[PDB]
Amino acid sequence: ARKFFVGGNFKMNGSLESMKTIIEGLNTTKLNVGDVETVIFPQNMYLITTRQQVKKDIGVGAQNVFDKKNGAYTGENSAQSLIDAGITYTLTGHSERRTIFKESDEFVADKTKFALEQGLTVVACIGETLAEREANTINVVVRQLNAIADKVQNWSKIVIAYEPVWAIGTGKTATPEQAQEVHAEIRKWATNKLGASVAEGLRVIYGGSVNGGNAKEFLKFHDIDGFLVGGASLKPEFHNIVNVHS
Amino acid sequence: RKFFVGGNFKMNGSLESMKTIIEGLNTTKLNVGDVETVIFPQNMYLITTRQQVKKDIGVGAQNVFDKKNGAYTGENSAQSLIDAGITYTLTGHSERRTIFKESDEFVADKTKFALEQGLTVVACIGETLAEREANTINVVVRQLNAIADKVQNWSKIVIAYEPVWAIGTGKTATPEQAQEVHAEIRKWATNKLGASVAEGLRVIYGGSVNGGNAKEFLKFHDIDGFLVGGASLKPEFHNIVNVHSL
């Protein structure tokens, strides 16, 4: 039985006031920590103050990390620095970084491997564009996942986030059935590549648009283990996703 | 032109080391009328650095994106920086141009947006080892022209000339070479922006500046300060920051 996982990706948003509000909101929500692993991923500059201010039952993660030890990489987040301040999670390979900053499959894998070695849990993001959806959905996520498998032996601290990039800004709303289809394919790939015990423990979270109302409709589908929430994670709605089981 | 000293911490730090580096700067006597001093910590420390370092010292990001708050996972927001009292940023550092392939045009776009949102920008330029053969001025003028194409007002720009071959290699440019590049940069600014703007423009030297070679630069009238790398994490930074005022 895989533990329900809800990540909140704030993206490149925030003010001092809005982050105080979000954090105080999370501190007063009734969390059953036994049945949900909750993590928020604030904009880089807020990482330490978010960890200081949000209660221990909520994880804090970076939105990106570099793949090397501390050194001369101006502008980057260090995995070593992150966990030294108590930031224990990170995203790698988010679609916005694969597209805007052309992060390669191999670069995402190397960041994942290094972050894991340094003690972080990695939410490794994958997903296909609309052109790739025409015929190559399986081939794309399989290729993205294989690059990670080439570098990473231990998947106990990986969770996979499936982003339906094809449904972003295309008028197309990705339905729960369409998500279930891909999540099943991801778990099939993991069974085939890593063995059944890894695949059955591996969280595969949906990273397309979701709210507290249809959260339950998505969780009715057989292979969806939680969510990487985008825009709703800045809003009170995030609490109804985190707390969906109660 | 007020002398400018920046300290680029790059992708370094721990809670313990960052607390003592800042405490070292807090208890260092400064002539703020004489030197504009700024430190650029790793992204995660931006808020705690602004909280802990005395008001006489500015804090800046090591990089910023070129758009308003939105869906750019992993990036620093210029609006968010300003909201929290971070009033500086680097753009175009050579490590970002080389590792992350930031173009002249992207750097110019970031510079313009950061300026519009209220930041002072240390726009970084410089030529490689191969370009040093015969193409030094072709390169820095091209990089500057891209900035001028997007930016009308240079009041809150500082130019940092860091020869790539001098970054982290220990091979400091001699002041005599630095002076002539800066003289060409000021010649370019005179022609492009007018003598008045050119005469107020800070052009600072970066590249293996340390407490032992700092003084030699002060005799050259087109070198308006330093962008210090590895030495900015060391107690000798306390020299470089004050050495103009001695």
Swiss-Prot record, chain A:
Answer whether the UniProt record assigns the keyword Transferase to this protein: no
Q: Which reaction does it catalyse?
A: D-glyceraldehyde 3-phosphate = dihydroxyacetone phosphate
List residues modified as Phosphoserine: 104, 197
State the pathway, as annotated in the record: Carbohydrate biosynthesis; gluconeogenesis; Carbohydrate degradation; glycolysis; D-glyceraldehyde 3-phosphate from glycerone phosphate: step 1/1
Q: What is its EC number?
A: 5.3.1.1
Q: Which Gene3D superfamilies match?
A: Aldolase class I
Q: Which principal EC class is assigned to this enzyme?
A: isomerase
Q: Which GO terms describe its biological process?
A: canonical glycolysis; gluconeogenesis; glyceraldehyde-3-phosphate biosynthetic process; glycerol catabolic process; glycolytic process
Per the record, the domain of life is: Eukaryota
Q: Which InterPro entries match?
A: Aldolase_TIM, TIM_sf, TrioseP_Isoase_bac/euk, Triosephosphate_isomerase, Triosephosphate_isomerase_AS
Q: Where is the active site?
A: 94 (electrophile), 163 (proton acceptor)
Listed A to Z, the keywords are: Gluconeogenesis, Glycolysis, Isomerase, Phosphoprotein
Q: What positions does the entry give for substrate binding?
A: 9, 11
Any idea which GO molecular function terms this record carries? Answer: triose-phosphate isomerase activity
Q: GO cellular-component terms in the record?
A: cytosol
Q: Name one Pfam family in it.
A: TIM
Tell me which family the UniProt entry assigns to this protein.
Belongs to the triosephosphate isomerase family.
Q: How does it assemble?
A: Homodimer.
Protein name as catalogued? Triosephosphate isomerase
Task: Give the species.
Answer: Schizosaccharomyces pombe (strain 972 / ATCC 24843)
